[PDB]
UniProtKB/Swiss-Prot annotation, chains C, D:
Compartments reported by the entry: Membrane
Role played: The IFNLR1/IL10RB dimer is a receptor for the cytokine ligands IFNL2 and IFNL3 and mediates their antiviral activity. The ligand/receptor complex stimulate the activation of the JAK/STAT signaling pathway leading to the expression of IFN-stimulated genes (ISG), which contribute to the antiviral state. Determines the cell type specificity of the lambda interferon action. Shows a more restricted pattern of expression in the epithelial tissues thereby limiting responses to lambda interferons primarily to epithelial cells of the respiratory, gastrointestinal, and reproductive tracts.
Gene name tied to this protein: Ifnlr1
Residue window of the full protein shown: 255 to 291 of 535
Name used for this protein in its record: Interferon lambda receptor 1
Top-level taxonomic group: Eukaryota
Subunit structure: Heterodimer with IL10RB.
Amino acid sequence: HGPICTEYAINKLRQEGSEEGMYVLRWSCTDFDNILMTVTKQFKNFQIEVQKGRYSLHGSMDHFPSLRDLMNHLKKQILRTDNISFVLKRCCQPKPREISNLLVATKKAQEWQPVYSMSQLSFDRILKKDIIQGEH
Amino acid sequence: PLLDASSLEYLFAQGQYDLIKCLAPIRDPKTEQDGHDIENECLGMAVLAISHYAMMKKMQLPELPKDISYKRYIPETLNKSIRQRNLLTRMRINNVFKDFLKEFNNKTICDSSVSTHDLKVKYLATLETLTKHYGAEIFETSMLLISSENELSRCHSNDSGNVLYEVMVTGNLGIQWRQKPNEEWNNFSYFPEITHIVIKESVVSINKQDNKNMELKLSSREEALSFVSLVDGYFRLTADAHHYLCTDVAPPLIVHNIQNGCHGPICTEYAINKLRQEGSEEGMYVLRWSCTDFDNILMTVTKQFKNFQIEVQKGRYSLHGSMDHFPSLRDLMNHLKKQILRTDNISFVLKRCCQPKPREISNLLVATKKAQEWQPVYSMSQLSFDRILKKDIIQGEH
Amino acid sequence: PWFQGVKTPRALDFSEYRYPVATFQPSGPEFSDDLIL
Amino acid sequence: PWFQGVKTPRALDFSEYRYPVATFQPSGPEFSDDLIL
């Protein structure tokens, strides 16, 4: 993801189940060369430096050529955090037209907002004398 | 349009007299610039007035210049203010007024091609926008009580202070009130929402549909009677023309109409359509006052649609072409119940009348933005409902 | 003061005009004749 | 012509002011340490 506010991504973790192992990736709103991931109750954040197209974790003397190469490498290890430890299991991906801070609210786009019909059914009746039943 | 060609002349005269006689209050300025601006606009208003008079007098200004002076067409307070000023300013404003009128009379009439009617609308609109709270009735009172009777509440609002309250009534706002400064008004209700009125000696108490009550007192009875006359007239003009609120101020003509069921000056197409809805069977008839004659009632019978007129003079009722007369409208119409009617080749007998319906839409009603929101919704073929999940309920004993 | 300021009143420009209702067309027939049963 | 007409420009009066977003508060922790299985 891009520079989306922290509350948005924190809420996104709640919707799926907040199980230990999930994580979300989004660009740091302040640094152009740093990606930050939020893992999850606890909500731990971790930053990764990206320089000259090379990918590596902060505090780690090794580096990896691809972002996917970087993140795949850490899949098979255990993570120690103070007293609690965990293993990532699955990422988070964007959704269609997902409402966020990056979107701009305009009067004309307001008319295109979807209607709220979470618990509403409407229908029109057809009088029994207005129809003729035919062959099967 | 609401008003006709006849009423606009009298309304223009009313506004003109209100402006010249200073009975209406002018708007106080906020600085010196707008203070001079209001005076200049008043002078232009006088220019418009003299131009209208000259055009309706049918001669150009130099033909009849002796009787021209803006003094007669400006508020008398402004007259007193300007007379206390220097002579040079007086001659200067004379020259400015002369220049403005000379420009308007010669050039604007050709540039705009306006008529006598055309200036009327701008005259009235300008008088509307220049006069503070124009066309409004404001009543100040020493006592005001508002109460609500919500469940276990019986909320007795307000207090027993010595503060003074003011009450203002306009058709385009409804009813509002506020405290008089030594503030923005708050809305209370609108005319159709009001249920009824009760008067106790010199106490006025109105009731709403949501059981809300507002009560207040006046110094005398006739003023409260005037106030309820206002509210009843507004209700009739907006909510229903076949109803009155207070029996003490009920106009007798509407009482007679209700006693008889006769309609007013409703357009022909409306009543013709009304006959279609019931079945257009031979025998029905509708009674409504002639839109042109005050002493004549016309009935429409019904395919054919035959109209018949009845003259009403000195309270006596009789059919046109008939040398006999009857004392009561009901006495008149009951008399003809038991006879046969010959019309050219076709004959028929009346069987049943037609009566008004609640808030029946017609030409007499006035369409306003605020009353538009109170229009009933269209759900002729729509059902909506909310489901309750079976796991969200617990079934108990019968 | 006002000697140095000259401006036509803003309430002299006209636009879009206006129109009331004129009247209603007078019309009414009369063809009654009556007999008893 | 303009000698006889003096008026301040209408774009000099101010009302209701305005306000943008200032910035975002910088904040980020780092507490990683790693071991193999």
